[PDB]
Design a protein around this ligand. Structure first.
Ligand code: DBV
Ligand code: DBV
Ligand code: PEB
Ligand code: PEB
Ligand code: PEB
Ligand code: PEB
Ligand code: PEB
Ligand code: PEB
Lengths: 70, 174, 72, 167
């Protein structure tokens, strides 16, 4: 079904945006942080895959990290 | 986790903050460290998936030759999708602190599915291996404090734990 | 002038020396290894899918993490 | 390369590529430098936009210019457009196309739309820092080791034209 856990981690300590997704207060800095866990379909549009192909087809270049094994 | 049970099995999400978050961190090993580790993998998910599929391909260009399994946008998108799925389930295993959901909802029957489709085992092994190496580096991140998003300490235990989860993937699908 | 078309040059560099797939896109032999390398350039409309931007908001909205490179 | 920027792709290999590299400064290194930027373009664009946003979270608040997918996509698109015109300026060894087809008239356009100058400044600065690090690369290297600092300062200057043009 191509679903997978989509986790979001908000360490928003000191953020002026008032929390309102839980409101179950705790009296500590845990009141400005949140783990959001959902399950959502994983999708890759053929347009995005065309963009990544164009980035891969050189076969030579890479990011800073990792050894060369091309 | 039963609040996280129904999640990783509808459309509605789940939100863990406040007092519940305080107690969740008391029930899982190294709660604060573990959240930092999860956040650094999932916040870099796109580069991890992209870099692993790209590296799988630069090592074996025939994968995007006319006969390769990543040839055409449809196949490439599905390969990118699978890499992301795998990484997401591994990221949930690190959040939960166990591989129950990973094995039951992601790895089960996966090797027989890839066999029937002719998805090549060696490319998949390289793809996951690279994602493993990316994830370990992000958990063990050894950069400056002005360039590290977390308080500096020792996370080799969590890195070893996530590496174990990736090993479960490679052992199951090859 | 910037013509609001969103079109930009899309460059692909192929250093494909020793590649078993034969060159066929350029049409001027030089008898050197240059025959196995190519610069491709097109003028394409740049578009970012609202799906991508949506998936990108989920990575960004944490406001904490980053790649390895970069100051905080 | 000028028929492109003004709909068929140009393919430059063989004798045409051999002559191109005799007509530009450091032809082989220049194409490696372009390769290392363009092959990393997605990560550069998204890291620069993400970095602009983590420095200023209100850009994705309801009042910010990246709020909604329509705007975020437009912003990611623009950063890629800018990055690609810079990569083309490095390919061709000058900034005439960059100034004419990309920057000429862009600042007035951003003013009318309300696209914030300061955020754009940071986004461009991050893409510059990225591109300089890939040209200077800052085992594990795809090219022969040597000195590409000249090309790095050249591409740094094309970003600086963008920075001057839209601030
Ligand atoms: C601080 C950082 C921020 C500044 C400064 C700013 O201008 N905006 C900031 C944050 C911001 N938050 C959101 C949206 C969400 N944030 C959360 C997480 C929190 N909810 C909570 O209950 C707690 C505490 C327990 C949190 C921490 C959630 C759930 C959302 C909604 C969307 C989601 O990702 O689920 C935005 C985006 C726009 C908005 O809704 O304000 C911004 C910019
Ligand atoms: C070597 C690397 C390869 C192995 C091994 C393999 O299995 N496939 C390899 C390469 C490969 N190339 C393409 C497609 C293109 N290659 C070029 C570049 C070259 N063509 C030339 O004429 C010259 C020099 C004069 C080159 C250098 C171009 C332009 C394309 C078309 C695609 C594009 O992005 O424009 C592929 C993709 C499948 C195919 O067409 O064979 C692969 C896998
Ligand atoms: C093809 C030419 C080709 C590649 C593509 C590349 C693939 C490859 N990548 C690694 C290792 C890592 N990649 C990482 C990814 C990232 N680092 C960052 O800073 C960003 C955010 C992110 C996306 C680009 C990381 C963190 C690593 C680990 C660090 C390291 O240097 O190892 C490898 C090595 C994997 C392994 O060791 O098994 C490979 C092969 N290489 C190519 O040749
Ligand atoms: C918000 C929390 C936040 C960010 C997001 C991040 C943005 C930022 N990034 C840099 C510097 C670089 N980013 C690079 C990007 C990449 N490197 C890779 O390997 C991959 C393929 C790619 C995508 C992640 C690079 C190469 C650099 C420069 C190299 C280096 O720094 O050694 C900066 C620094 C900008 C500057 O110096 O002005 C910033 C701000 N940082 C955040 O805080
Ligand atoms: C390994 C992953 C890391 C590393 C992590 C450490 N984090 C430490 C403390 C810490 N981290 C957080 C953030 C965390 N808690 C949350 O609730 C959420 C979001 C929901 C997050 C992201 C907190 C709050 C704390 C506690 C102290 C503080 O307030 O800053 C930490 C300290 C030791 C320890 O807590 O055992 C470490 C080592 N360090 C590393 O070097 C790698 C990269
Ligand atoms: C800075 C960009 C780099 C770096 C690059 C160097 N490249 C050098 C030589 C070189 N590069 C190529 C490939 C190039 N020419 C092409 O036609 C194409 C594609 C169309 C590409 C990608 C060639 C052919 C050569 C010449 C040598 C060879 O035959 O392999 C080089 C050597 C110095 C010089 O030639 O002046 C360097 C230093 N090196 C670095 O350390 C940074 C990161
Ligand atoms: C990329 C790293 C691979 C590669 C992958 C491909 N997978 C293809 C199809 C496919 N993958 C799955 C498993 C996926 N779906 C799930 O629900 C889960 C976990 C919850 C996972 C991991 C399925 C079920 C399928 C078939 C149905 C579908 O497409 O959704 C695929 C397409 C094959 C084809 O079009 O014939 C590819 C290309 N291919 C590679 O070469 C590397 C190694
Ligand atoms: C991201 C770093 C920015 C940001 C950017 C936005 N730009 C928006 C619209 C827009 N951008 C252009 C310039 C673009 N079109 C071109 O043809 C070229 C080069 C040839 C470029 C650079 C135009 C013409 C437009 C308007 C028309 C259109 O969208 O196609 C935009 C949308 C505004 C809106 O409609 O609300 C955004 C958000 N926003 C940011 O916050 C950072 C700084």
């Amino acid at each position: 079904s191509a679903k997978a856990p989509a986790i979001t981690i908000f360490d928003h300590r000191g953020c002026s945006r008032a929390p309102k997704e839980s409101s179950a207060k705790s009296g500590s800095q845990d009141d400005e942080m949140l783990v959001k866990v959902a399950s959502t379909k994983v999708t890759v549009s053929e347009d995005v895959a065309a963009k990544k192909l164009q980035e891969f087809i050189g076969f030579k270049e890479k990011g800073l990290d990792g050894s060369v094994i091309r | 986790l039963d609040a996280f049970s129904r999640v990783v099995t509808d459309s509605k999400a789940a939100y863990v903050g406040g007092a519940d978050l305080q107690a969740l961190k008391k029930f899982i090993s190294e709660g604060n460290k573990r959240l930092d580790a999860v956040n650094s993998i999932v916040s870099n998910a796109s580069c991890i998936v992209s870099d692993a599929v790209s590296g799988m391909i630069c090592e074996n260009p025939s994968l995007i030759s006319p006969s390769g399994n990543c040839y055409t946008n449809r196949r490439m998108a599905a390969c990118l999708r699978d890499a992301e799925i795998i990484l997401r389930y591994v990221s949930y295993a690190l959040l939960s602190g166990d591989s129950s959901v990973l094995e039951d909802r992601c790895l089960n029957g996966l090797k027989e599915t890839y066999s029937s489709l002719g998805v090549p085992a060696n490319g998949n092994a390289r793809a996951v291996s690279i994602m493993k190496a990316c994830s370990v580096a992000f958990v063990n991140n050894t950069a400056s404090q002005k360039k590290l998003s977390t308080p500096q300490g020792d996370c080799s235990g969590l890195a070893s734990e996530v590496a174990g989860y990736f090993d479960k993937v490679t052992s199951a699908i090859s």
